[PDB]
Amino acid sequence: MLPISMSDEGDSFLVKDSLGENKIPKNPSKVVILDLGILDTFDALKLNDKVVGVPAKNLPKYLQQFKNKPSVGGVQQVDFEAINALKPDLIIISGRQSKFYDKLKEIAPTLFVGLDNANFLSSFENNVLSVAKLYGLEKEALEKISDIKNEIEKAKSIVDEDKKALIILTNSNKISAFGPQSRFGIIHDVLGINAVDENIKVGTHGKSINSEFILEKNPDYIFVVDRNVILGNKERAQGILDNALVAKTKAAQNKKIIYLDPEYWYLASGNGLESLKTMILEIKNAVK
Ligand SMILES: O=C(NCCCCNC(=O)c1cccc(O)c1O)c1cccc(O)c1O
Ligand SMILES: [Fe+3]
CA distances from 93 to 19, 81, 172, 181, 243 (A): 11, 17, 28, 21, 40
Is the domain spanning 1-158+261-288 CATH 3.40.50.1980? The answer is yes
Separation CA 32–CA 75 (nearest Å):
12
Q: What is the resolution of this structure in A?
A: 1.6
159-260 matches 1-158+261-288 in CATH topology: yes
Report whether 110 contacts 93 (CB < 8 A).
yes
Ligand 2 centroid from CA 75, angstroms: 9
Give the torsion through C-alpha atoms of 9, 12, 14, 18, to 10 deg.
150
The Cα angle at residue 220 between residues 257 and 174, in degrees rounded to 5: 50
Q: Are strands 12-16 and 5-8 parallel, antiparallel or unpaired?
A: antiparallel
Radius of gyration over every alpha carbon of the chain, rounded to an integer in angstroms: 19
Separation CA 64–CA 136 (nearest Å):
26
Q: Which residues are annotated as a binding site?
A: 143, 147, 161, 188, 198, 205, 266
Report whether 149 contacts 164 (CB < 8 A).
no
| Identity of residue 241 | L
Q: Where are the domains of the chain?
A: 1-158+261-288, 159-260
Separation CA 215–CA 258 (nearest Å):
16
The dotted CATH code for 159-260 is: 3.40.50.1980
Residue nearest to atom 23 of ligand 1 (CA): 96
**Cα dihedral sign, 233-176-114-193:** positive
Separation CA 238–CA 227 (nearest Å):
12
What secondary structure, in 3-state letters, does the chain show? CCCCEEEECCCEEEEECCCCEEEEECCCCCEEECCHHHHHHHHHCCCHHHEEEECHHHCCHHHCCCCCCCECECCCCECHHHHHHHCCCEEEECCCCHHHHHHHHHHCCEEECCCCCCCHHHHHHHHHHHHHHHCCCHHHHHHHHHHHHHHHHHHHHHCCCCCEEEEEEEECCEEEEECCCCCCCHHHHCCCCEECCCCCCCCCCCEEECHHHHHHHCCCEEEEEEHHHHHCCCCCHHHHHCCHHHHCCHHHHCCCEEEECHHHHHHHCCCCHHHHHHHHHHHHHHHC
Quick one: residue 73, left, alpha or beta (phi over 0 = left, psi -120 to 50 = alpha)?
left
Ligand 1 within 6 A of CB of 57: no
Pick the closest to residue 132 from 240, 212, 13 (CA basis): 13
* HSE-up of residue 166 (Cα within 13 Å, Cβ side): 31
The Cα angle at residue 55 between residues 174 and 107, in degrees rounded to 5: 125
| Identity of residue 182 | S
Pick the closest to residue 211 from 265, 181, 251 (CA basis): 251
CA distances from 234 to 170, 171, 224, 229, 276 (A): 12, 10, 17, 8, 28
Contacts 24+ apart (CB under 8 A), 172-175: 172/228, 172/233, 172/235, 173/235, 173/239, 173/240, 174/208, 175/208, 175/209, 175/210, 175/211, 175/214, 175/240
Q: Which of 72, 96, 178 to mutate to test the pocket of ligand 1 (most atoms within 8 A of CB)?
A: 96
Separation CA 262–CA 224 (nearest Å):
9
